[PDB]
Amino acid sequence: GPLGSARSDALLWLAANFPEAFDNSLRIRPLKIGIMSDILQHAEKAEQVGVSKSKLREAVVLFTRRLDYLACLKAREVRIDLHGNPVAEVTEEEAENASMKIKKRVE
């Protein structure tokens, strides 16, 4: 389909291929700590459509600095893997770190 004037082709690829993690059309959920390495195992298929390992890292940084991502990192919320499986909880220190980032972004 049409592609927009400013976009992340890497994040579009991630949302198409791992919607449980990167499709936020309805909701957004905390991601497994270290999900970047899980993503990098799929780098070959991304490279076939011109998506580089660096751009995949860039896309994950973009996603996880969204205010809506930072706001979903509340203590005891469930972290999911690339396929939506629960793996861990957001800790109190992780929650605190996210609330400080939000407060600084919104000040």
- The alpha carbon dihedral of 46, 52, 53, 57 has a sign of negative
Q: Where are the domains of the chain?
A: 9-106
Quote the CA–CA distance of 45 and 43 in Å, as a whole number: 6
- CATH of the structural domain 9-106, one choice from 1.10.260.40, 3.40.720.10, 1.10.10.10, 1.10.1710.10: 1.10.1710.10
- Residue 19 φ then ψ, to 5°: -65, -25
Half-sphere exposure of residue 70, counting CA atoms within 13 Å on the CB side? 16
List Cα–Cα distances, 90 to 18, 102, 104, in angstroms: 21, 16, 20
This structure's resolution (angstroms)?
2.1
Alpha-carbon 56 to chain mean position? 10
Picking from 40, 88, 27, 97, the residue whose alpha carbon sits closest to that of residue 65 is 97
Q: Which helix (H) or strand (E) holds 48?
A: helix 43-48
- φ and ψ at 22, to 5 degrees? -120, 0
Give 89's contacts (C-beta < 8 A, 6+ positions apart).
75, 76, 77, 78, 79
List the structure tokens of 51.
């998506």
